[PDB]
């Protein structure tokens, strides 16, 4: 089982010097660094090439996360936005291929954060979304990428809030490259059972995000890690597990994540690295 | 210990025929019915008295919940809005006195739902609100009403997200009639420890909301009810416990609570009643004594 | 599911006026009353028939538990003992048949409590037990009785301490009416996973005892009830669930169960009744899907 | 806090080459090695000193555990036995002083394992034990040793089974060098609440043993480690945390601990080393601060 961390645990914006984090994460022992997709369309082939070489040189595998903007919304009623959305993932998936990245995840079937002042048409968005994703999946297949649909809590999405919904949506899409992605932070709000959600995901589970109830590093909170380890084994999960802790206020990230108190308690970079490493030790011990 | 349920469990709007629910609730065995405050300002003294009369007749105690509108936002930098807010509350409080309800709770220090497409000024809203609430605290005291500030999760508010912040804020307000309020649904998100949060609230805890991780009635979910019960015994809690389940899509309630799937699983009113009563027995059994 | 309670929750000896308890549990709403086997061998035909009629007239099903004496030890190396044991069970099972009882459970593959003053021979005891149980099974079968082997903690038995061991032992016996029986109080000690244990027992699970970690009535302690209910659902368990609370000091029961403090907090009979009933309500509410 | 492991994790008899284990746990990274008191009485002053020196050299602190024999029973109604027991501990304590050991724990107020064959007289034994312990306490104070009374499950002792009973006994003894000692294995069986037991022990808590429900190394079982960490922080625990895993069949340890299956599942010495090391990391991580 491969273990990673989202670079944003250290940064307040959806972009960073990924080569720097690739190096940090390697020294700390992770197998994976997960990066945000948004600066990738602004990279020259030269940059893509060197990011790839840097990760390869450091033994790090790269996975991608992405919170789509309203304009990249595959479920939109506006046919133009859906058109632009498809172009965006087509381009992006192509870059992922160049980067030798085989996994992308997040609210890929919608956009994030969601605007609730707006009027919600779930039934509508759900059908348009399923339709758009199947097309994109063609490209994903072609690019050797698993398109992972993350199940999110009610306050961050209205389309898919439980693993059962995720499975229904994926089955309905019905394409090899579209998987379900669960996240302990989100399962904690919506699920009747954590082990049950994993088991429901079953073979469809393609990626796993981890964090405590309030998004701290895995291990000293209330998440039922031992139960998760059991369930993952029950379903023979071989995928990767990426922690995505958010413990700092300020910035696009602090705001989007709604961190309104310093949950890190003044942690400095060295401190942050220490806890992430300890949490990585915990995860390998407990989850496998 | 006194147990109640919020009338919204059965309705999709922030008002309804309370007399109807008082009767249903007395029949299912609850001690309390919690009602939404919004319609109360438009009650004639006659209908206020009939409500109070209904409750007394059915042996039910009434408590009130309230999600403030932006215009009622006591923390708003706009002084006109603060004015409307404080005026609104004193009329409401005075009315509560007439209906002999001694408890109101909710994001009373802010507004709800919150508009997150706006820029957040926590420290600013925080000092304003503290000043605003202390002021309101006086009318609350004269009306014999406990003004409870409910700790909410990050997605529903940004001023008070943990019991520690609720206590800091209530100690700052520094007034006898202002209490911290906890909700198992909100604690499940923000707290390192449920039992620890209750012990942190301690003497200041004046009200408690219950619901499973996903807002189903208490009982078959992951919320740690026994730890809650033991922590309530640790502090010596003397308030009531109101379950606030939300399992239905639709209306302002469904959209305000973000119920995007049929969590009730097709329940008709009679099934909704069965489940509420069973959770009532569960709660009296698991949360008491220790 | 069918829910019961063990009569000993109200008594300090391994026998009592079962009719009194049948009337009691029926009014409290239980489906089952579980009774101790020990006085049955001394029940005359009409006493047996009267107990049966009492159960039937009250909508109550009777189940049976037994802590075997050393003289009833089917795993004994002494062949005479094994012979006496087979004869004791044979007679008992025929009595259960007259009682219209179809389930007996406990450390039926050994004896209880164990004298840990004697040297253990697990392997030898295990093989003799498998043999003896095989032939007793044949008698139970003909009597219409499921023979349930209860998995116990290490301080009360050395042969079968985990659901996995109970499954191994039962597969070896290889008789359809012989089953694995789990108990929340014993799993709490020996199992890595509660739900895991239940899923391990699976189709072989034939009976379930409940109690908190310290044997208080189910619901207000640390036992993972919700996890248990989910796992029972996964294996499709539809059998019986008998709570076995022990909250009082004194007598053979207090001594055998090792209750060395008043866990009941001065509860009187009516107080004990109210608790059981609340626990029944809880069990029915939380354990079913 | 300082973390340790009981040497018996690797041995099947209540004795062993302690020097060897001191060097083993130093390399594995532990702060402490806990050893059985049994062989200490047979130690020349030369032996004592090298052990003391071996510990000091590897930066390992030594703590002592002891399962008293019937002849060492301080609660015994036979005055000759109580006499011999005082003699035994007064000497053991003098030796501990020479080893610079500041802590000893186990069923020091009774004997272990107990013969549940005899007639148990809890009330009598309790009073005898209280008085005897208090006397021994004097010798402990003089030798600068903390006399830790471990609370055990009903199958292994009948005098003290819950932290509440432990605090009562200790408060009755009324002596500064007598502490309550808790063990996650035993609390898991007898306590309503784990965090609650720890808070109940509070300042009387002088030592803590850890292990999963079935005695594997801490970490992948059902013990509520976080709740424990949080409770220890609630009481500002000022002590050591020693893991006491028992995963091997055979010998007096296999028999006394009642290991009737290979819970280690084939582990060789290296494997055990690794698992204990992972458990250590787990423990410092999960149990610290909060
Ligand atoms: O869990 C999520 C946010 O609530 C997402 O996984 C987010 O963090 C990604 O950065 C984009 O979807
Ligand atoms: O918990 C709450 C909303 O998340 C509130 O308690 C809400 O349900 C009331 O209706 C308004 O305070
Ligand atoms: O659980 C058991 C004792 O530990 C048994 O189930 C016992 O209580 C019965 O009375 C005899 O097996
Ligand atoms: O936990 C204990 C008994 O089960 C004791 O701590 C024991 O393991 C020691 O060896 C007795 O000193
Ligand atoms: Mn995520
Ligand atoms: Mn609430
Ligand atoms: Mn309790
Ligand atoms: Mn109780
Ligand atoms: Mn049992
Ligand atoms: Mn111990
Ligand atoms: Mn913490
Ligand atoms: Mn922390």
Residues A259, B190: Cα–Cα separation, whole Å: 10
Q: Please name which of C112, C104, C91, C86 lies closest in space to residue C35, comparing C-alpha atoms.
A: C104
Residues D147, D68: Cα–Cα separation, whole Å: 13
CA angle (D242 as vertex; D238, D243 as ends), nearest 5:
145
D167, D260, D263, best to mutate vs chain C, most C CBs in 10 Å: D260
Name, in order, each residue with C-beta under 8 angstroms of B272's C-beta and a sequence gap of 6 or more. Answer: B9, B10, B247, B264
Residues D128, D109: Cα–Cα separation, whole Å: 9
Residue found under tokens 């095989």 = C134
CA angle (A213 as vertex; A210, A215 as ends), nearest 5:
60
The residues facing C3 across adjacent strands are: C241
| Distance in angstroms between the alpha carbons of the first and the last residue of chain C | 10
Residues C96, C85: Cα–Cα separation, whole Å: 16
* Deposited experimental method: X-ray
Task: Identify whether the C-beta of residue C205 lies closer than 8 Å to the C-beta of residue C239.
Answer: yes
Residue found under tokens 């148990």 = D120
Residues D47, A247: Cα–Cα separation, whole Å: 53
**How many other C-beta atoms can be found within 10 angstroms of the C-beta atom of residue D116?**
18
Please name the fold of domain D1-290.
Answer: TIM Barrel (3.20.20)
What Å resolution does this PDB entry report? Answer: 2.1
Q: Residues for chain A: how many in total?
A: 288
CA-based nearest residue in chain B for residue A156: B155
HEC per residue, C208-226: EEECCCCCCCCCCCCCCHH
Of A11, A34, A150, A275, the catalytic one is A150
Helix (H) or strand (E) holding D42: none
Residues C168, C166: Cα–Cα separation, whole Å: 5
CA angle (C228 as vertex; C222, C231 as ends), nearest 5:
155
Q: Residues for chain D: how many in total?
A: 290
Q: Residues for chain C: how many in total?
A: 289
Q: Residues for chain B: how many in total?
A: 290
Sequence ranges of the domains in chain B: 1-290
Show me where chain C is broken: residue before each gap, C-N > 2.5 A. Answer: none
Q: For chain D, give percent helix, strand, coil, nearest 5.
A: 50, 15, 40
Inter-chain contact C229–B219, Cβ cutoff 8 Å?
no
Q: How far is CA B164 from the centre of its chain?
A: 18
Residue found under tokens 């189903």 = B216
Cis peptide before C113 (omega within 30 of 0): yes
Helix (H) or strand (E) holding D240: strand D240-243
**Can you spell out the DSSP letters for chain C?**
-EEEEEGGGG-SSS---HHHHHHHHHHHT-SEEEEESTTGGG--HHHHHHHHHHHHHTT-EEEEEE---GGG-TT-SSHHHHHHHHHHHHHHHHHHHHHT--EEEESTTS-SS--TTSPP-HHHHHHHHHHHHHHHHHHHHHHT-EEEEE---TTT-SS--SHHHHHHHHHHH--TTEEEEEEHHHHHHH-S-HHHHHHHHGGGEEEEEE--TTSPPTTSSS--HHHHHHHHHHTT--SEEEE-------HHHHHHHT--S-TTTT--HHHHHHHHHHHHHHHHHHH--
A244 is in an annotated binding site: yes
Buried b (16+ CB within 10 A) or exposed e, C97-129: bebbbbbbbbbbbbbbbbebeeeeeeeebbebb
Residues D65, D108: Cα–Cα separation, whole Å: 9
Measured from the Cα of D65, ligand 4's closest atom is 12
Check pocket membership of B209 for ligand 2, CB cut-off 6 A. Answer: yes
**Can you spell out the DSSP letters for chain B?**
-EEEEEGGGT-SSS---HHHHHHHHHHHT-SEEEEESTTGGG--HHHHHHHHHHHHHHT-EEEEE----GGG-TT-S-HHHHHHHHHHHHHHHHHHHHTT--EEEESTTS-SS--TTS---HHHHHHHHHHHHHHHHHHHHHTT-EEEEE---TTT-SS--SHHHHHHHHHHHT-TTEEEEEEHHHHHHH-S-HHHHHHHHGGGEEEEEE--TTSPPTTSSSS-HHHHHHHHHHHT--SEEEE-------HHHHHHHT--S-TTTT--HHHHHHHHHHHHHHHHHHHS--
Name, in order, each residue with C-beta under 8 angstroms of C108's C-beta and a sequence gap of 6 or more. Answer: C66, C68, C74, C89, C133, C136, C147, C148, C149, C150
C-alpha dihedral sign at A16, A19, A20, A21: positive
Q: Please confirm, yes or no, whether A230 is among the known catalytic residues.
A: no
Tokens for A60? 């790090």
| Helix orientation angle between C18-28 and C269-287, rounded to the nearest 10 degrees | 50
Q: How many CA atoms lie within 13 A of B184 on its CB side?
A: 31
Tokens for A105? 């995840």
**How many other C-beta atoms can be found within 10 angstroms of the C-beta atom of residue C50?**
14
Helix (H) or strand (E) holding D105: strand D103-106
Helix (H) or strand (E) holding D243: strand D240-243
CA angle (D195 as vertex; D190, D196 as ends), nearest 5:
70
HEC per residue, chain A: CEEEEEHHHCCCCCCCCHHHHHHHHHHHCCCEEEEECCCHHHCCHHHHHHHHHHHHHCCCEEEEECCCCHHHCCCCCCHHHHHHHHHHHHHHHHHHHHCCCCEEEECCCCCCCCCCCCCCCHHHHHHHHHHHHHHHHHHHHHCCCEEEEECCCCCCCCCCCCHHHHHHHHHHHCCCCEEEEEEHHHHHHHCCCHHHHHHHHHHHEEEEEECCCCCCCCCCCCCCHHHHHHHHHHCCCCCEEEECCCCCCCHHHHHHHCCCCCCCCCCCHHHHHHHHHHHHHHHHHHHC
Q: Which residues line ligand 1 (CB under 6 A)?
A: A 65-67, 106-107, 112, 150, 152, 156, 183, 209, 244
The residues facing A58 across adjacent strands are: none
Task: Identify whether the C-beta of residue B109 lies closer than 8 Å to the C-beta of residue B75.
Answer: yes
Burial of residue C236 (number of CB atoms within 10 Å: 0-12, 13-18, 19+): exposed
Q: Which residues line ligand 4 (CB under 6 A)?
A: D 65-67, 106, 112, 150, 152, 156, 183, 185, 209, 244
CATH assignment of A1-288, among 2.40.280.10, 3.40.630.30, 3.20.20.150, 3.40.47.10:
3.20.20.150
Name, in order, each residue with C-beta under 8 angstroms of B158's C-beta and a sequence gap of 6 or more. Answer: A258, A260, B114, B120, B122, B125
Check pocket membership of C215 for ligand 3, CB cut-off 6 A. Answer: no
**How many other C-beta atoms can be found within 10 angstroms of the C-beta atom of residue A260?**
20
Task: Report residues near ion ligand 10: CB below 5 Å.
Answer: D 183, 209, 244
Task: Identify whether the C-beta of residue D275 lies closer than 8 Å to the C-beta of residue D266.
Answer: no
The residues facing A241 across adjacent strands are: A3, A208
Q: Please name which of A208, A266, A272 lies closest in space to residue A240, comparing C-alpha atoms.
A: A208
Residues C23, B21: Cα–Cα separation, whole Å: 38
Burial of residue D119 (number of CB atoms within 10 Å: 0-12, 13-18, 19+): exposed
Q: Please name which of D30, D25, D90, D18 lies closest in space to residue D54, comparing C-alpha atoms.
A: D18
Tally A–D CB contacts below 8 A: 31
Which CATH number describes the domain made up of C1-289? 3.20.20.150
Buried b (16+ CB within 10 A) or exposed e, B58-84: bebbbbbbbbbebebbbbbeeeebbeb
Helix (H) or strand (E) holding D181: strand D178-183
Name, in order, each residue with C-beta under 8 angstroms of C33's C-beta and a sequence gap of 6 or more. Answer: C4, C5, C7, C18, C21, C22, C25, C55, C60, C61, C62, C63
Q: From residue C186, give the alpha-carbon distance in Å to each of C60, C153, D114.
A: 27, 5, 21
**Would strands B205-210 and A240-243 be described as parallel, antiparallel, or unpaired?**
unpaired
Name, in order, each residue with C-beta under 8 angstroms of A107's C-beta and a sequence gap of 6 or more. Answer: A67, A68, A149, A150, A152, A156, A157
For D150, the 3-state DSSP assignment is: strand
Residues B248, B213: Cα–Cα separation, whole Å: 15
Task: Identify whether the C-beta of residue C114 lies closer than 8 Å to the C-beta of residue C158.
Answer: yes
Under DSSP, the state recorded for D78 is -
B285, B286, B287, B289, best to mutate vs chain C, most C CBs in 10 Å: B285
Residues B219, B154: Cα–Cα separation, whole Å: 25
Q: Please name which of B148, B201, B157 lies closest in space to residue B179, comparing C-alpha atoms.
A: B148
Residues C5, C66: Cα–Cα separation, whole Å: 15
Under DSSP, the state recorded for D9 is G
Largest CA distance in chain B: 49
Name, in order, each residue with C-beta under 8 angstroms of D149's C-beta and a sequence gap of 6 or more. Answer: D105, D107, D108, D109, D133, D160, D166, D169, D170, D178, D179, D180, D181
Q: What amino acid positions of C are annotated as catalytic residues? A: 150, 244
Under DSSP, the state recorded for D157 is -
Residues B99, B101: Cα–Cα separation, whole Å: 6
Contacts of A282 in chain D (CB under 8 A): 282, 285-286
Contacts 24+ apart (CB under 8 A), C123-129: C124/C77, C125/C75, C125/C76, C125/C77, C125/C158, C125/C159, C126/C75, C126/C159, C126/C169, C128/C74, C128/C75, C128/C76, C128/C77, C128/C82, C129/C74, C129/C75, C129/C159, C129/C169
Residues C64, C14: Cα–Cα separation, whole Å: 12
Residues C157, D139: Cα–Cα separation, whole Å: 40
Q: How far is CA D26 from the centre of its chain?
A: 20
Q: From residue D153, give the alpha-carbon distance in Å to each of B143, C253, D156.
A: 54, 17, 6
Task: Identify whether the C-beta of residue D175 lies closer than 8 Å to the C-beta of residue D131.
Answer: no
Residue found under tokens 């307000």 = B173
Under DSSP, the state recorded for D73 is -
Task: Identify whether the C-beta of residue D13 lies closer than 8 Å to the C-beta of residue D288.
Answer: no
Residues A159, A111: Cα–Cα separation, whole Å: 10
Contacts of B220 in chain C (CB under 8 A): 226, 229, 285-286
Residue found under tokens 């091997």 = D248
Residues B198, D110: Cα–Cα separation, whole Å: 39
Q: How far is CA B119 from the centre of its chain?
A: 26
The residues facing C146 across adjacent strands are: C103
Under DSSP, the state recorded for D2 is E
Name, in order, each residue with C-beta under 8 angstroms of D265's C-beta and a sequence gap of 6 or more. Answer: none
Tokens for B227? 């730890």
Q: Please confirm, yes or no, whether A244 is among the known catalytic residues.
A: yes
């Amino acid at each position: 089982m491969k273990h990673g961390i989202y670079y944003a645990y250290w940064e307040q914006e959806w972009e960073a010097d990924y080569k720097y984090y690739i190096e940090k994460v390697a020294k700390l022992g992770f197998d994976i660094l997960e990066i945000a997709a948004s600066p990738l369309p602004f990279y020259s082939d030269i940059q893509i090439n060197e990011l790839k070489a840097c990760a390869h040189g450091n033994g790090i595998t790269l996975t991608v996360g992405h919170g789509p903007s309203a304009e990249q919304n595959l479920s939109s009623p506006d046919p133009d936005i859906r058109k632009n959305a498809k172009a965006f993932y087509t381009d992006l998936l192509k870059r992922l291929y160049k980067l030798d990245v085989h996994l992308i995840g997040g609210a890929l079937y919608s956009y994030w954060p969601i605007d609730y002042t707006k009027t919600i048409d779930k039934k509508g968005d759900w059908e348009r979304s399923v339709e758009s994703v199947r097309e994109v999946a063609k490209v994903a297949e072609a690019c050797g990428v698993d398109f992972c649909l993350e199940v999110l809590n009610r306050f961050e999405n209205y389309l898919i809030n439980t693993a059962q919904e995720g499975v229904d949506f994926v089955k309905q899409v019905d394409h090899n490259n579209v998987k379900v992605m669960l996240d302990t932070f989100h399962m904690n709000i919506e699920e009747d059972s954590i082990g049950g959600a994993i088991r429901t995901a079953g073979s469809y589970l393609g990626h796993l995000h981890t964090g405590e109830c309030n998004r701290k590093v895995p291990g000293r909170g209330r998440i039922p890690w031992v139960e998760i380890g059991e369930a993952l084994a029950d379903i023979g999960y071989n995928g990767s597990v990426v922690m995505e802790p958010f413990v700092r206020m300020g910035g696009t990230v602090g705001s989007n994540i709604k961190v309104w108190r310093d949950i890190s308690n003044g942690a400095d970079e060295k401190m942050l690295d220490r806890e992430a490493q300890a949490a990585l030790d915990f995860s390998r011990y407990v989850l496998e």
